[PDB]
Every structure is written in C-alpha cells, then in structure tokens.
Design a protein around this ligand. Structure first.
Ligand SMILES: COc1ccc(C)cc1NC(=O)Nn1cnnc1
Length: 165
C-alpha cells in the first residue's frame, strides 16, 4: 500500500514524490493524470506518465479522442493505467496559462469522488499555472475519497505542508 505520506485530513495524504516512481512502486488501482482536453500528454505530469508507458498512454488516448472528441475542462475519463496502475483517471483542471476559469478546479476534483482511492497530483498546479496552495485547499474541501497526493518539488511540498490550515 501507500507509505511515507503525511496525513493532512481524514482522507487526504501528501508526499514529496515523483508520481511516476510512486505509481510504479504502488501499482495503485487509480493514478490521476493532469490531462488536457485533447489528452495530448506532452509535458508536466502527463508527459512524464505517458513517457513511463512507452507512449502507450498517448496511443490509447488518441483513439479515445478520435472516438469521443475532447474532454471538457473540469471533466475526466477513465483509461488504462498501463504499467503504472489498473486505471488512469485523466482529469482536466483549468489551465490558468490558457485563461481557463480557476472556478473549474472544484469540478475537476469532484471526479476523484468516483474512486475509493487514488494516487494523484495537485490539479492545475505546475505548468497549468494555478497556485498549488489553492489547489490543495480545493482538493481537501472537495474530495471525500482517499487521495494520496504526490508533489514532485520538495520546496513546494514543504511550503504546502507548512502553510496547510
Ligand atoms: C499496475 O497495476 C495494475 C495493473 C492491472 C491490474 C488488473 C491491476 C493493477 N493494480 C493493482 O493490482 N492494484 N491494487 C490496489 N490494491 N490492491 C491491488
């Protein structure tokens, strides 16, 4: 199971970890991807998860988009977890750098409630441009299922824990 996490609340845990390494170690039922509406896994968490699957995530994602069209910002889809997890829940948080509504971050986190336990990154953090302290707050106030957050950056992890109310 999950090890080395700091408990923030009844259901939210956090660790300074590379989510790819964490997924390969735990092989959780669900790993969350910080997806975009096109499921183009170029960079950030998505680029790293996809690279760990040897591009199989991108091949599966392109077939999903060809059939279904793009996701909505705030939406998600369940696809294979490949070698990382049983499933990957691709969740689209708003990208502040694309001028997307930050209010959609709560809708994005609501997708996590359909899964009992998830390994996840902070939505809309990193290259998505939102404040990770705000993302953690929305996470704790929205997600009711068990979420194990992996924060890659040690300095950000320390800031998130030390400022957690
Ligand atoms: C790479 O991981 C999988 C791949 C395929 C499958 C069918 C399952 C997994 N996961 C897995 O077994 N996770 N788990 C969580 N709690 N007990 C077991």
């Amino acid at each position: 199971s999950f090890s080395g996490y700091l408990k923030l609340t009844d259901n939210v845990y956090i660790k300074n970890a590379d989510i790819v390494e964490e997924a390969k170690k735990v092989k959780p039922t669900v790993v969350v991807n910080a997806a975009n509406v096109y499921l183009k896994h170029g960079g950030g968490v998505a680029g790293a998860l996809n690279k760990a699957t040897n591009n199989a995530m991108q091949v599966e994602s392109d077939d999903y988009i060809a059939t279904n069209g793009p996701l909505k910002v705030g939406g998600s889809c369940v696809l294979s977890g490949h070698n990382l997890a049983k499933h990957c829940l691709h969740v689209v948080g708003p990208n502040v750098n694309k001028g997307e509504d930050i209010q959609l971050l709560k809708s994005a986190y609501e997708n996590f409630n359909q899964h009992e336990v998830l390994l996840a990154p902070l939505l809309s953090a990193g290259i998505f441009g939102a404040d990770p302290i705000h993302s953690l707050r929305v996470c704790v106030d929205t997600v009711r299922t068990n979420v194990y957050l992996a924060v890659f950056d040690k300095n950000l992890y320390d800031k998130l824990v030390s400022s957690f109310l």
